[PDB]
C-alpha cells in the first residue's frame, strides 16, 4: 500500500516460514472460516435470472457485435462438422476479428483509458475532457488540449 | 500420598509419549525440516554472494 506518514519500523523479528494469518487462539471458529455463516432463505432467486445478471454485469457486446460474438463459435463448430472448406472458416474468423476490433475502436473512451495524470485532474475538467474527446475530431482535440499531455509542464 | 512409584511408571511416560506424538515428528522438525530450511538459505547465499 501507500503511506502518507512514515510507518513504525518492526523492532521484533518474525519467522519467515510461519503462516501469516491470525493466531489459532485468536481464531473465531465457525465465523472466520465460513462454516456456520450460511443460513438458507426462502428468498432465493431464479437460476436463469442469476445467469442473466452475471452475463449482463460483464457488459456484453450488443447488437451486431453481440450477434457475431454469439454466433462465431457455433458457426465454426458446424463448419468443421459439415466438412466445409477451412479457408472459408479462416476468412470468417479474420473478418470477425477485424469487424470486432473496428467496432471497439468506434466505442467511446472512458476516464480509465488515459494516463494517471489525466485521471487525477479536477473532476469537472476531466469530465469536460472526456466529453470533448468523444465529440470532436482527434486533430482538433490535439490542437486544443495537446499541451495537457506534456507532463513536465506542471 | 500420590505414590511416586506409580506416577512416573506409566502416567507421566504414557502421557508424554501420546502428547509428543512419539517424539518422531518433532525429530522430523528438528533434523529434516529446519535443516532443509537452512540448506535452502545456504544455497541462496551461494547464489547471491
Amino acid at each position: 500500500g501507500l503511506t502518507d506518514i512514515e510507518p513504525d519500523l518492526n523492532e521484533d523479528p518474525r519467522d519467515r516460514w510461519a503462516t501469516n494469518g491470525v493466531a489459532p487462539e485468536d481464531f473465531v471458529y465457525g465465523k472466520y472460516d465460513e462454516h456456520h455463516t450460511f443460513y438458507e432463505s426462502s428468498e432465493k432467486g431464479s437460476f436463469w435470472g442469476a445467469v442473466a445478471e452475471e452475463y449482463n454485469s460483464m457488459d456484453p457486446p450488443t447488437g451486431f457485435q453481440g450477434l457475431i460474438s454469439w454466433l462465431f463459435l457455433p458457426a465454426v463448430a458446424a463448419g468443421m462438422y459439415f466438412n466445409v472448406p477451412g479457408d472459408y472458416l479462416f476468412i470468417g474468423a479474420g473478418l470477425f476479428v477485424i469487424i470486432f476490433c473496428i467496432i471497439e475502436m468506434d466505442k467511446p473512451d472512458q476516464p480509465h483509458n488515459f494516463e494517471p495524470q489525466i485521471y487525477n485532474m479536477e473532476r469537472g475538467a476531466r469530465d469536460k475532457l472526456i466529453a470533448d474527446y468523444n465529440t470532436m475530431d482527434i486533430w482538433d482535440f490535439n490542437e486544443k488540449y495537446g499541451d495537457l499531455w506534456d507532463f513536465t509542464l506542471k | 500420598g500420590q505414590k511416586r512409584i506409580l506416577g512416573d511408571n506409566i502416567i507421566t511416560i504414557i502421557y508424554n509419549w501420546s502428547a509428543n506424538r512419539g517424539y518422531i515428528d518433532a525429530f522430523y522438525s528438528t533434523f529434516l525440516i529446519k535443516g532443509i530450511r537452512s540448506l535452502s538459505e545456504l544455497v541462496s547465499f551461494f547464489d547471491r554472494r
Binding site: L2, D4, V76, A77, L89, V97, H112, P116 | -
Partner: protein, 93 residues
C-alpha cells in the same frame, strides 16, 4: 480378433481386449484450429468486457497505470511532495 485368452495353472484365466487406436493428424489439426479460433473469440469478447478492478477508482485513483513500479514511485513522490509542501509553506510564511 484383438482378443487374447491366457490360461495359467493355479491362476484364473485372463481375457485381454486390445484396440490400437490413435487420433489422425487431421483431427489434431482440427483441435489446434478450433483452439486458435476459440482464443481469438475469447480475446475479442473479454477485451470488449469491462474490468472490475483496473477501471475502478481504487486502482486509477491511487495513481495506477498498468506499470509494475507505480507503487514505489508514488510513495517516493508523495514523500518528496510533502517535503516540497513544507518548503512552500516556509517560503510563504
Amino acid at each position: 480378433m484383438a482378443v487374447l485368452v491366457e490360461h495359467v495353472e493355479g491362476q484364473r484365466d485372463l481375457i485381454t481386449h486390445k484396440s490400437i487406436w490413435h487420433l489422425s493428424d487431421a483431427a489434431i489439426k482440427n483441435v489446434y484450429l478450433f483452439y486458435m479460433m476459440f482464443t481469438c473469440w475469447g480475446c475479442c469478447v473479454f477485451g470488449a468486457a469491462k474490468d472490475p478492478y483496473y477501471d475502478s477508482e481504487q486502482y486509477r485513483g491511487d495513481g495506477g497505470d498498468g506499470t509494475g513500479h507505480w507503487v514505489y514511485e508514488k510513495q517516493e513522490d508523495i514523500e518528496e511532495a510533502g517535503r516540497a509542501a513544507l518548503w512552500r509553506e516556509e517560503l510563504i510564511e
